[PDB]
Design a protein around this ligand. Sequence first.
Ligand SMILES: [Ca+2]
Lengths: 40, 556, 142
Amino acid sequence: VKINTKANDNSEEMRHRFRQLDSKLNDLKSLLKEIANNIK
Amino acid sequence: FSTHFSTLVYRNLQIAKNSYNDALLTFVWKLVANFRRSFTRHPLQALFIWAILQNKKELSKVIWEQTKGCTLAALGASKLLKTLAKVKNDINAAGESEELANEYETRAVELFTECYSNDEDLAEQLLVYSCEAWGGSNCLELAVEATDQHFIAQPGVQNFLSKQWYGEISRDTKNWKIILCLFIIPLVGCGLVSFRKLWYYVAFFTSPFVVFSWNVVFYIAFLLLFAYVLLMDFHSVPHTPELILYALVFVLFCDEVRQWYMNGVNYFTDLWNVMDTLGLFYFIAGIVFRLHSSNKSSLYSGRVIFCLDYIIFTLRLIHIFTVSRNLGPKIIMLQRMLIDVFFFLFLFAVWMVAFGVARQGILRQNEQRWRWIFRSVIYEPYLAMFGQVPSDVDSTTYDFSHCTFSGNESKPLCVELDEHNLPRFPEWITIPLVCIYMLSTNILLVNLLVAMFGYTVGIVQENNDQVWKFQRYFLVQEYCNRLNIPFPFVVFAYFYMVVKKNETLAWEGVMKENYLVKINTKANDNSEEMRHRFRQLDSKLNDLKSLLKEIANNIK
Amino acid sequence: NLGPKIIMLQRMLIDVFFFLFLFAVWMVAFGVARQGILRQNEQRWRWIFRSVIYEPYLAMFGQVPSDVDSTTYDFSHCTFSGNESKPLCVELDEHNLPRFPEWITIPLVCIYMLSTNILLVNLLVAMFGYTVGIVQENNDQV
Ligand SMILES: [Ca+2]
């Protein structure tokens, strides 16, 4: 467990957070497109 | 090569290559003249040389990368750059030339690592390959005549040279057991000793290693026998062992003469050969002296010269034995450290002269004898620095009342003429000066040198090993030039000789491609993809905003 | 804390071996050139070996032996006959004149003294130096 923690101590979670942010932005864009389609 | 080549560097290059002491420079000059005079072929070599000459590092690197003969091209380019860099006196051109030469040398060194690791046999085959019209010579032939000890110091090259020196002997046995196996005639009994990985019996003698061991045994035996002949027995008429000594020494002289004949130019430049040549030159004078007994004691004088040369032979004994595994490296650093010896000798000598000057101040008004003035001034402080201080003549022994005032008597030392039978020499300044000299020399200057020597070792100890490895090569090469032959049969063989006298490149290219891929991966390992990901995210956000604007426009 | 110092000597003995060899060759040369002064023929293994070994062996440590020829000049005490067991001798003087020339013998004494007493000895201290600090860290473990 200690070895795994040392390996994980890289602290690169910002990349995953950015990926999640991009996914959320894509979801928002898809929701906007769906709203536009529903309006039309 | 004529129009775009220009003349700024062409004139200097031609002038320097007219007499540059480099065969590669002569070949380059000939190629340049042919290109200008013209108005396998190896054209890409000429193109690469052109690229290198005007200090175009990126263009030269690309052209080299395109050329097939990457390793040899890089080696020779680095050699030529280092050779021609310093002819120009510019402080800017020299820096760029040195930087490019070092970059290319390290580039080739790092390239060869992957090739050696992937296939040792492929590397071994590649190194020994005559080039085509581009200064044809093997890899190590260029490397050794290029300095660049870093390339030859790499472990793979050292292992190759070790196996070459071993030759037809398989390295699977302890060194001591192999040494003992040299002395045993049959190899059948020594099953445990790894001779190989009567035919195989005769294969053993062909190893240069065994030849070198036999040579040192013979040389030490010769030294001992020659010393016995010189000192133990000497007569007006020479006798059997003396004649055999002449025979043996002429055998060695002939071997050295053959070595000189093989390489005349480097013989004079080489330092070690000079000492043995001088020793032989004095030895022939020794024979001349012993020829005719013109005077009753005229033979002892020549025996003196014989002995003086014997000293030089004793030194050559160490000279030849230089490289011996862990023993050899210690010898080299002494050559570099001799500067400290020189400086210490000078500094101590001046103090010696002053103390000798002040020793004679006690003595009589006028020595009037070069013999004793020189003898005393030199000899006395020379002991004091080592032991048994001489000032005991004046202080420790006070007055011994033994002086030969008359010049006829050859008696050491004297005392200044006593006044009214009273010893006039005053102690109150003479003895303190003795103490000052003792303190200055025995305990300060001596103990300085130890400290000095200290810094000389640790600072330069790391590099020393490399040099030793380099030196190792030379001996191998030498014993590779003479192959294997016993000394007495060696003389006869020399006389007889005097009477008589593709796929690897493709593999290297593939390895170079793999190495370039590795270099590209190392460059790309920066791991800066997050910037590109952020740029893509911004582009996606802009696209979403544009889509929203388009939807709004469609609604309106 | 006493024990660790012993081990490093075993590793450092290589320096002792190398120094012994290098000093021995110089010793042999100087012993060769010491006997050049002496009579044409020693004809006695006993004294030739005794002198050649023993003399430079002191010179390297102390009380240089060349005082037989230079410092003491000629003592006029030689047993030319082999029967007499007397140390040392002088080359047969020509017309009662000591034939041994100083102008080369004494300089050689000085060269040997410089080579051995102050250079080869003071080398070993330096050498030993690097042997310690480089390997001192590991020694404790052993
Ligand atoms: Ca030689």
